Design a binder for this molecule. Sequence first.
Ligand code: HEM
Ligand code: CYN
Lengths: 499, 499, 499, 499
Amino acid sequence: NRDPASDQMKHWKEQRAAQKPDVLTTGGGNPVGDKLNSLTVGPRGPLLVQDVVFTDEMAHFDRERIPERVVHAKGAGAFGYFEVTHDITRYSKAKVFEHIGKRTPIAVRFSTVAGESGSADTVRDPRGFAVKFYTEDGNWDLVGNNTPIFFIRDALLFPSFIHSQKRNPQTHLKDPDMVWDFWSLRPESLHQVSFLFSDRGIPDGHRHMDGYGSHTFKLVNADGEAVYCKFHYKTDQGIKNLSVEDAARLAHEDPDYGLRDLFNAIATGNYPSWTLYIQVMTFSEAEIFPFNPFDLTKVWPHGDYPLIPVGKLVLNRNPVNYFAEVEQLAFDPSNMPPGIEPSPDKMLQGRLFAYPDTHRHRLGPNYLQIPVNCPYRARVANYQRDGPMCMMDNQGGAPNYYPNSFSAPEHQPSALEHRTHFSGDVQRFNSANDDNVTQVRTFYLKVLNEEQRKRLCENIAGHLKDAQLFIQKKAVKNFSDVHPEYGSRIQALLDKYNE
Amino acid sequence: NRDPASDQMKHWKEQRAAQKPDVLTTGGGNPVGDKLNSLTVGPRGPLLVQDVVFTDEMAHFDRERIPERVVHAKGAGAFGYFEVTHDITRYSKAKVFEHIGKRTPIAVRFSTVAGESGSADTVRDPRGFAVKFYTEDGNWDLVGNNTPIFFIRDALLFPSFIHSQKRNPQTHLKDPDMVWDFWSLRPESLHQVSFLFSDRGIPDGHRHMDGYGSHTFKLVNADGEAVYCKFHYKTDQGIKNLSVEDAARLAHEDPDYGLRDLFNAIATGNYPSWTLYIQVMTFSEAEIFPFNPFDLTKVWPHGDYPLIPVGKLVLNRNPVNYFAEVEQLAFDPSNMPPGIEPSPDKMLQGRLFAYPDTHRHRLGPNYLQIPVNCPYRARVANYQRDGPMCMMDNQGGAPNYYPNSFSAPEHQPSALEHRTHFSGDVQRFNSANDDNVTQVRTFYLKVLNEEQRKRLCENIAGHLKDAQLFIQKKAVKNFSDVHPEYGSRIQALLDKYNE
Amino acid sequence: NRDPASDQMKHWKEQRAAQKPDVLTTGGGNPVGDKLNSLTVGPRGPLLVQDVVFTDEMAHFDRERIPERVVHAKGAGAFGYFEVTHDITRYSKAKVFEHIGKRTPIAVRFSTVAGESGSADTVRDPRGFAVKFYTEDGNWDLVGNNTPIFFIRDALLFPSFIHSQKRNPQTHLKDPDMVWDFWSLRPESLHQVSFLFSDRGIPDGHRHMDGYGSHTFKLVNADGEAVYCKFHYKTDQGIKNLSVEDAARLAHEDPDYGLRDLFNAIATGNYPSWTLYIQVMTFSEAEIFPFNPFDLTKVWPHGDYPLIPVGKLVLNRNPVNYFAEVEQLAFDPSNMPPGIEPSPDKMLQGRLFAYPDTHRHRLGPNYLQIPVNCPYRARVANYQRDGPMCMMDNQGGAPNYYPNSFSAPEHQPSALEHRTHFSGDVQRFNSANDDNVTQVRTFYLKVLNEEQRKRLCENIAGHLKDAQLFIQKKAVKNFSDVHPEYGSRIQALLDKYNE
Amino acid sequence: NRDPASDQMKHWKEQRAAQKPDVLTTGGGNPVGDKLNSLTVGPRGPLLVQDVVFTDEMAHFDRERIPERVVHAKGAGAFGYFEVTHDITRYSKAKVFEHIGKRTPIAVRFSTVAGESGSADTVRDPRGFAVKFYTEDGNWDLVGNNTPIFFIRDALLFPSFIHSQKRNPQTHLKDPDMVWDFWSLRPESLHQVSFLFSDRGIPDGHRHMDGYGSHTFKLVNADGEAVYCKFHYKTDQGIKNLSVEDAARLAHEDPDYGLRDLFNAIATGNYPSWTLYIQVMTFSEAEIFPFNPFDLTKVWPHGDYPLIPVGKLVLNRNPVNYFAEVEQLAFDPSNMPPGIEPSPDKMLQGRLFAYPDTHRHRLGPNYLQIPVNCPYRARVANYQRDGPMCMMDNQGGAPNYYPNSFSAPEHQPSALEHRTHFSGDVQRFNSANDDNVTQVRTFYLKVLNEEQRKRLCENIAGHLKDAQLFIQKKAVKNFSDVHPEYGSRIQALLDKYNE
Ligand code: HEM
Ligand SMILES: [C-]#N
């Protein structure tokens, strides 16, 4: 009796008992006598502007679509909650970490990157794992990928990068030259490239993948002590990837594979879950790290900085209306309540700006006012007013300037940001040469096995092959620098593909 | 102390009581630690991207403004109720007239016409009197002026009319050449131009003027019998207008005179009111009527068509937040509940398209979702989805197609349009010379008395005198047609004015 | 060496040689010193708002996306010209057909339907074939499809139809319950559904494939005599379709298959072309003719109304910048120069509003000001002003109200529309029953050969086999209502799929 | 014959002697038959959607309005040129100062601050004076006011400030409590408040007022040597302001007095001009300066930092279409070319963000492409693409990723920002007490004479008298802090006013 998903309407008509259906109305609420036959003059005459029943619906029709996400356009979402299982208060005075058994409702949206709205899940691309913590101190957004690292470490190259992985400005077709001309000129991607073309390249569904905040963040206890951290939410359904083969099969067989896997899962009562951990680094150690603790192209070896469990990320309800609750979702890295703060991680810094920016454009100035985005477990009160599509009462007739002598909202000094010290010139400091191989080399011949080491080298060559020859070399060169073998294997492969 | 309007905050803080100032949060609901000083590297250093309290706030301010209404930009609003005092049901079956005593929540917006957001209330100009009935059959928006007639009878000339009435495309100044060159070329305006330059051209506040639906409408009863009608809502505060010197004074002394007079009255249990009447006419009568019964430049003489009392219009509530409840208010003449239907009035016909059309651009595709515009009395159920800034549930997961087989919203034969028959060549009929003198002639001699006729001519001459001689000629000519004396009197003044 | 599309950048550079690369600047033209390293205080310090180079690029990137077309998102486009080869002057006075040899620049975008921007080119779904003629009497948009009929005959059914073919409101996946449920309760779709599931369902590229004006139109000659007609532009590369499996693999092998094909063809000098034909029907015949001549689910048979030759459609130019020239492309069926006029088609009429309406939403109010949409081979002069993103000079200091005595644009009586007579009550006429089978049966037998007839039934069952039985019944019922074996054959197929 | 502005259309008609009126067309370029009569039913029948000429025009009319500037909405603009007259090449290497005689086009917009578009010109209020220099190195926007200081010093107070300066959230009226409750609590304003209420508060048009950069900026020469500065461009027409008397008369007799004046002056060859001087403070002196050198509520005494002639700002060309060339006009302080950078001024810092941020909303993502805003004197080349209302060729088929090996634009190292060192903890430093009286006292006692102090206190007390008693206390208290005599005089006046 198909799957829970396919029976979407099925279950709807049922649960809708036997009570009559609501009356079809116009946006205004005026009942429609007949919305199947246009208002015409004669059985074969023209249409009347007077058929506002028509205009009303058609009008709305022509405006349903809104701009898709610049990146991560294709994804799925579900709601659930978080719960504490450990006490890290000695680490961060965040309200969500209150005490054990302390729950918080969440929202999540998995997704790919380069692919548009029509794209299919089952394909090589990093994955999006975003969590919205509707806390008491406002919503907390831990926007993270399925990997602890990224290709670039300076926000200034992301626009270019994304462009590189997307379409040709002219042909509107994917383009290897673009893809690899960028990667080749910027070896800093070496680390993440290797992760993309590794088995992890294509997770089997969203449920069998690990979550990562990626960036280095900052924790601060109710005592004013701050320490750098890294979030890790590992899957409790075990890691499971998809063969280049299956992936491509599913790709066209069920483009929305990863999509319904999630739905049915939650429907068949088999709710997904991830275990939230966090690494820790004192400012002392941070000054010692063999690298930049804020370099997005690096990791904190688990041996030197072990994961501390903190909580359970459980999803148990699926969106009722996809658009409203998922397509419309807004995740802002800048959304961090008292206890959690960003690090000087140049990429994070940029994200502090881009997300709310794009949201205002994709969704609208008052998008945080959208049900799904509104921090309902907090009391939003301030001196911001109006704006297009202003919902709510817009804070009634309350004094709209600060300061004021009329009892309008005051600032809670107990939430002040954490004071740090920086000494140096304001300049554009070149981070293009901050070691792009070390951690990579120990990933090729260390994290991976000879078995999957060959699968990786294959996956890569199967794409790099399509790039101009002048591109192919410069590329191998990099892989070469990570390890002559990790570069020779790939090359060999190319020579064969290359005929 | 001072007036209620001026005591806005005072009263707010008192009612607020001894409570504690809500915690000042970002749009995201995060507490602010100090919204008075920016995050900088040093006491005299750069501003950091890291300051999201600033940007969260700043970015909203930058997006505070929405386009003002292209016309009737300046205005004041108030909510109240509509009470049925009679049984008119013998004509219209709208559930808004159902049973005597039946109260229907209403919203009202008064306004001028030409002036933009910052203009003054005390200037000569028609006046807007929009009434929104939140009925159980959706919303009823009766968008009427304080005059029963208008300057033109074909929408095709409205865009141009409003242009001539506003600013010159290059100097951005008021243009008497645009104003009069247009009016002169369209004598059909003579009627309303008369009513305009008369003592009624500037009413003393909104509480002292009448409200007219202007257009001819339609009423369909339970049996399905229809009738043409006109709406009339006379003022219970009595017709009181302002003099050129006093209106001209208040222009600078208090540009928001109307907005204030209205706030204060209501704030002191001094609720304004209007009795609602209607002129009922038969298709057979509309057949006999000597003039085009749908021509916007004509009136239905009280004599032959006496007014029938319907109910009362009380405004007993003031807007809490002006932007959210007034600025965003949107009345669409097409929102007529079952029982009320439009008429062939060319003018009205065009308005059926414009209001929601422009509302989509001024407010947004989902404007009908704004609390003030939402038909909170009736239940909105249909097959329209998505659209930017989608509030509520987007009808959750109910079927989006129609018809369907899963118990989704159904038709309503009862609420069907009343069918009328028309015959003729579908073409653009020149309605330019449908007599633009007869009714003005009566207004000039029978409606006005000598002292009023005196003013009407000085008021005209005082503004017309700035247009070029040739326009003045053409202009006067049209006046003599209504009446020899009308022309000569104005002409007389012009020669004087032309020193 | 590789295909022309792949070598896009390669050539762009090659030809750009002998030239120094332009200086990288900001949106404002200020040269940037370094666009790879953000501005921070100290090498490991926070990002400074100061870095305006950053915000400029990021803010713009954060807004690259505009809403995709509500339908026909996945498409491709090219440019060419139209050449008059034959004289149909006695039918249309339209300057486009003026003389033999008359060249008129054109632009075209082909597309699929339901699938979103990321979808693949080769799938069962009709194909949009819109043609924009930049004529001296303004642009003429012939928004056609690769089929001469459509699933429905009343605009009111469209928003609902489209929803069925799209995603589920809650599970966001494609849904056969909606697809069929709709098609079941709506049999008039039979004609098109058959054609669709036919071999033509997956044309090769956008070349080989035919284009049809689809709707019935009206032609007017220099003597006011009007006649009805159907537009036809047959491929010069002969109808060639894709196999189910073939197209099924290309689906993931190369989703942009069309894009590639069309680009490379043109790029290599292999410019495709089409021959335009017209079927003419006189008002007399339109009267006698034996189902509604304006029904969109019906077709005129070359039998009685033989195809007449008019001219050639040649595409010899590729888009330089895709987004700018194809994505932003807007076609309005309502754009018809003198000689061409709408027809009572309930379906058409509706299109007369949706298109510009949605364009103002998706592209913006001044969309006709975007280069490729501008009627550049004409002289747009009128009384329209302002609007957002207003380009040009807003028509400069020209008078902006009509009429006027200042030499502003005067209208042309010549361009007056042809008048027709339409008698009959103005109401909602039921058309759900206008024969949704006759012609359909003639396709299954006469047109379709035992060969295609086999794959048609097979293709239908292959899809329909996923919907509840109660639907399958209704679906087979209508088919057998066309011809016993039609559904009979389907039914057999259906039962095997249901294990 | 009237003022040159009155005859706008006259000279336009005259302008095209001869020349025949262009043909009235739709937005698509289709010629119009009858633009005065809609297409109806019969002479008294309904309207047909089939009428596109109407809908084309109406839909546009319905979207003419865009959000008015959040502040400084009511203004006037003009174009002219900038001419170098002194070699200041030892301080700035900017090309706009490249060499004596060199002329650069400029665009200027004058403005009030609080009133919306309908507001009156002649009212006490600072005055906006923005200059746009279309320099070879991109556009340089010097966004100055008519005062060298400002009320607040930290951007976070700005939204608040402006709010208190506008209408009441509930009553929508100007709130004296709002105005003085805010000023009373933030004494840093005293300086501006005093300047504001002096004879300089209501200038006589835009031609008789000085223009000031206000903020301190950083000039950078060819040797990479930096220096701080302040821009001053004094009227050549002489500082002339209006009296509280005439100003109130003009407020109703001519709400557009400034608009009209500027136009006419230019129209009659009487071009206004301004001599541009600059002040120079070396990094050393900025160290021992008695006040914070980047504090907006302070000035650099001519005595120690003498003005230096640079060149002349001349305006000799009126806008042809106010909207297209003035209303749409946009200035960004961020637009600074090589040799002209920002200071750490907390206020200037927040501005680098807000202008482009707001322009992207008021005008749209691609507002830099609007003619008036485009840097048409430089070659904009970069890796930015798409966005709505994308004009030009969107950089065509150029490589869209940086870096790339395909000859796309490259960064110019000689346009890098001058590196400055800053050291301190990153925190929210409190500048609320950075001396808010010294300079004020000098203005009161030295800059003004008795006659003046008298008018000032009268002007201050005039408004203040309306605020609640407790607010008057606080305010007078602050004035006494500047000078015992200062507060007393105001207090005496208050004592009076209050009966
Ligand atoms: C009466 C039902 C129809 C309505 C209301 C309708 C509505 C729409 C809308 C709103 C768009 C998006 C336009 C844009 O954003 O540029 C569109 C696009 C399109 N439709 Fe129609 N459509 C209808 C029927 C069809 C049929 C019947 C055809 C086949 C001749 C067709 C061919 C197209 C094409 C080719 C496009 C994309 C044009 C392009 O930009 O390349 N549609 N339709
Ligand atoms: C519009 N009145």
